[PDB]
């Protein structure tokens, strides 16, 4: 078998920079390699084949070189649209094998989150459970802290967070924090607040609602 070792596993770069991804084959593969771009939530698309032949229709900002065991994909003039994971594929010998992929992220100016809080649906509360959601919209950098406070007492253990992939347009992230409670414990308290701390905010932003 042929083993493809790809590096780096992930990288961060600024708009207009030049980024290079490398795949190393376990032995010479005589340029029988192709590269692919996979944008978030999408399927891979062809970029280069035969190590250095650019697919007609793909931007000239992509370039491929290599011989023997070492092959490179170079991406010049990095744009926000290029946020994706890039893979190699060797067609030298079956079974065809892929590199582990390089996750390419974009560095941009700091952007603060727009914070929103959502109380539980009346529909779900009839079923006996209550979900309170806190939304942090279009912020950068990815790092952020979200702390729940019920009756302004810190709450922990009953929340799970989920974060989107980097936006292809503004290179920002969005985050959801979901606090889930029984209706009984939900009705035990009155104030529900989401305290958010982030680079782009002067001070921690707190959004709250009162039950009733």
Residues at the contact surface with Na ion, assessed by CB under 5 A = 10, 12, 26, 32, 91, 121-122, 178
Peptide bond just before 95 cis, omega within 30 deg: yes
Q: Report the SS3 class of residue 80.
A: helix
Cβ proximity to Na ion: between 131 and 152 the closer is 131
Stretch 73-102 residues interacting with other proteins (CB under 8 A): 87, 89, 91, 94-101
Cβ proximity to other proteins: between 50 and 110 the closer is 50
Q: Does 139 bind other proteins (CB under 8 A)?
A: no
For the residues of 48-62, what is the DSSP string, one character each?
Answer: EETTTEEPTTS-TTE
The answer to whether the beta carbons of residues 195 and 149 sit under 8 Å apart is yes
Among 17, 32, 105, 170, binds other proteins (CB under 8 A): 32
Polymer length in residues for the chain: 212
Q: Does 154 bind other proteins (CB under 8 A)?
A: no
Cβ proximity to Na ion: between 60 and 157 the closer is 157
Stretch 105-124 residues interacting with other proteins (CB under 8 A): 114, 116, 118-124
Q: Does 45 bind other proteins (CB under 8 A)?
A: yes
Using CA atoms, how far apart are residues 118 and 168, in angstroms rounded to an integer? 26
Using CA atoms, how far apart are residues 202 and 50, in angstroms rounded to an integer? 52
119 binds, among other proteins, Na ion, none (CB under 5 to 8 A by kind): other proteins
Q: Does 156 bind other proteins (CB under 8 A)?
A: no
45 binds, among other proteins, Na ion, none (CB under 5 to 8 A by kind): other proteins
Cβ proximity to other proteins: between 37 and 78 the closer is 37
Cα four-point dihedral sign 163, 170, 194, 125: negative
Question: What are the start-end ranges of the E strands in the chain?
Answer: 4-7, 10-14, 19-25, 33-38, 45-49, 53-54, 62-67, 70-75, 84-90, 97-98, 102-107, 114-118, 129-139, 145-150, 153-155, 159-163, 173-182, 191-197, 205-210
127 binds, among other proteins, Na ion, none (CB under 5 to 8 A by kind): other proteins
Contacts with other proteins by CB under 8 A lie at 30-32, 34, 36, 42-46, 49-50, 55, 87, 89, 91, 94-101, 114, 116, 118-124, 127, 131, 133, 135, 137, 160, 162-164, 174, 176, 178, 180
């Amino acid at each position: 078998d042929i083993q493809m070792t790809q590096s780096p596993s992930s990288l961060s770069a600024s708009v207009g920079d030049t980024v290079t991804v490398t795949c190393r084959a376990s032995q010479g593969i005589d340029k029988e390699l192709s590269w692919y771009q996979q944008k978030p939530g999408q399927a891979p698309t062809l970029l280069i084949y035969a190590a250095s032949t650019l697919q007609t229709g793909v931007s000239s900002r992509f370039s491929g070189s290599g011989s023997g065991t070492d092959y490179t994909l170079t991406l010049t003039g990095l744009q926000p649209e290029d946020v994706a994971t890039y893979f190699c594929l060797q067609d030298y010998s079956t079974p065809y094998t892929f590199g582990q992929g390089t996750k390419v992220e974009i560095k941009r100016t700091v952007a603060a989150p727009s914070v929103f809080i959502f109380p539980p649906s009346d529909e779900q509360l009839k079923s006996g459970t209550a979900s309170v959601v806190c939304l942090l919209n279009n912020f950068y950098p990815r790092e952020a802290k979200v702390q729940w406070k019920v009756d302004n007492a810190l709450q922990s253990g009953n929340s799970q967070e989920s974060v989107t992939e980097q936006d292809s347009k503004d290179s920002t992230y969005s985050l959801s924090s979901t606090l889930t409670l029984s209706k009984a414990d939900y009705e035990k308290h009155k104030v529900y607040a989401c305290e958010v701390t982030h680079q782009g905010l002067s001070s921690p932003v707190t959004k709250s609602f009162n039950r009733g």
